Amino acid sequence: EDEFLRYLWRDYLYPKQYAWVLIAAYVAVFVVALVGNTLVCLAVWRNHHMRTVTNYFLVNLSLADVLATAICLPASLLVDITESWLFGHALCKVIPYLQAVSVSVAVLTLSFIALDRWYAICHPLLFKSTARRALGSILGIWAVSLAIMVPQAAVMECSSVFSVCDERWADDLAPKIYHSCFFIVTYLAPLGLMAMAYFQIFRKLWSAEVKQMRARRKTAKMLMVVVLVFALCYLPISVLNVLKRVFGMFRQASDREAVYAAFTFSHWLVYANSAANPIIYNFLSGKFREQFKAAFSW
Numbered sequence: 001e002d003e004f005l006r007y008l009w010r011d012y013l014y015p016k017q018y019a020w021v022l023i024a025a026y027v028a029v030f031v032v033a034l035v036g037n038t039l040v041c042l043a044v045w046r047n048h049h050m051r052t053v054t055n056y057f058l059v060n061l062s063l064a065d066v067l068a069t070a071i072c073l074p075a076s077l078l079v080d081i082t083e084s085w086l087f088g089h090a091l092c093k094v095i096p097y098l099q100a101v102s103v104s105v106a107v108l109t110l111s112f113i114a115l116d117r118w119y120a121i122c123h124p125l126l127f128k129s130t131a132r133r134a135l136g137s138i139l140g141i142w143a144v145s146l147a148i149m150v151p152q153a154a155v156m157e158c159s160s161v162f163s164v165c166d167e168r169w170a171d172d173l174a175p176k177i178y179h180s181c182f183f184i185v186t187y188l189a190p191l192g193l194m195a196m197a198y199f200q201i202f203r204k205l206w207s208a209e210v211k212q213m214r215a216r217r218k219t220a221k222m223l224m225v226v227v228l229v230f231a232l233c234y235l236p237i238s239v240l241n242v243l244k245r246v247f248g249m250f251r252q253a254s255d256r257e258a259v260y261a262a263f264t265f266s267h268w269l270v271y272a273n274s275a276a277n278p279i280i281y282n283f284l285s286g287k288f289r290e291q292f293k294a295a296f297s298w
């Protein structure tokens, strides 16, 4: 008698509740990431004491996050709902390209933040870190990120079956080599180097010198948290694409709905990172929190 009651859940209640959780998480992250990263930029613009090398890199990180949130997030939500591509051939190349560029700008900015902190803290006076040179490095980050993701744009193809956007690979081996390289370069190597750098920064940082020590320890604490949430937020999708592209996993159709759910949550986590960073600055930086509240109360 309760077969009908269970089927109503299986066929209507659950599907509606799951589409609802999906759209609500994607929308909340959209709003929070857009507003918070814009506030990061406006805060750095308003408070001159915040115009440090690190904060310039953090505004660039917020700029990359705003790019991915404004353009890629709505499209990623539509793909995760319908498992189909509704934006045409050109956008099938452009949107994935901007997603890869956003990831590359983000990880290089964190790398250069860790490099600046490592030279400033661990081997001092060797290299000068000025805001104009930091701005030069920022332009170089965009130049590299835009150049090295061109192959990513090149492999995208939009083909019908109701269109579907996916990578078109000429050989069995090329996707494995490319995604091995992509994983090692945009995730594992920069984050491992940053972890050893921040480990050394932590060991070296832990009487008038103490005033400097009080400010630098707080920012370093904040920066390590930024790196950690990044490594955590990007870990699942990065691992999943490797298992899919290098190891050939997730091709059985008996569990197609479970794989869609896992990839959808991992996509959502990438965007959740853009929402998460401004909250991190608000709770680990007193200057940022004050500027956000000066903006917040208006």
Ligand SMILES: CCCCCCCC/C=C\CCCCCCCC(=O)O[C@H](COC(=O)CCCCCCCCCCCCCCC)COP(=O)(O)OC[C@@H](O)CO
Binding pocket: 111, 112, 114, 115, 118, 184, 185, 186, 188, 189, 190, 192, 193, 194, 196, 197, 199, 200, 203
């Ligand atoms: C795509 C490229 C983009 C690059 C973008 C640039 C990003 C750059 C960011 C920061 C650079 C900072 C580098 C800091 C490196 C610090 C490395 C280091 O010393 O760490 C050790 C711990 O691990 C060790 O033993 C050595 C651990 C070895 C095992 C590592 C496994 C690989 C994981 C990771 C793979 C990365 C490899 C990249 C190679 C090019 C020891 O600590 P400790 O205080 O005792 O030292 C005292 C000692 O220096 C006395 O001689």
Ligand SMILES: COc1ccc(S(=O)(=O)N2CCC[C@H]2C(=O)Nc2cc(C)cc(C)c2)cc1
Binding pocket: 072, 073, 075, 076, 079, 095, 096, 097, 099, 100, 103, 152, 165, 182, 183, 186, 187, 234, 237, 238, 241, 270
């Ligand atoms: C290491 O961390 C990562 C993080 C993300 C990826 S990715 O899978 O997102 N990516 C690979 C090809 C390029 C990019 C991709 O397909 N974008 C994308 C695809 C669709 C259909 C829709 C949207 C909005 C973006 C890979 C590694």
Ligand SMILES: CCCCCCCCS[C@@H]1O[C@H](CO)[C@@H](O)[C@H](O)[C@H]1O
Binding pocket: 010, 011, 012, 014, 015, 018, 257, 258, 261
């Ligand atoms: C954690 C797992 C997440 C899976 C998400 C699946 C969302 C849609 S449920 C779907 O509803 C249909 C209604 O017609 C039924 O016919 C199917 O049997 C059932 O699968």
Ligand SMILES: CCCCCCCCS[C@@H]1O[C@H](CO)[C@@H](O)[C@H](O)[C@H]1O
Binding pocket: 130, 132, 133, 135, 136, 139
């Ligand atoms: C393509 C132009 C991009 C503009 C970004 C500027 C990058 C730094 S220029 C550099 O600034 C240093 C500041 O300390 C001076 O010491 C040097 O003499 C001068 O060469």
Ligand SMILES: CCCCCCCCS[C@@H]1O[C@H](CO)[C@@H](O)[C@H](O)[C@H]1O
Binding pocket: 154, 155, 168, 169, 170, 171, 174
């Ligand atoms: C011994 C092996 C020799 C292989 C020679 C052919 C190499 C083809 S690369 C090919 O270029 C395309 C350009 O569009 C991409 O779309 C594909 O994904 C990619 O695979």
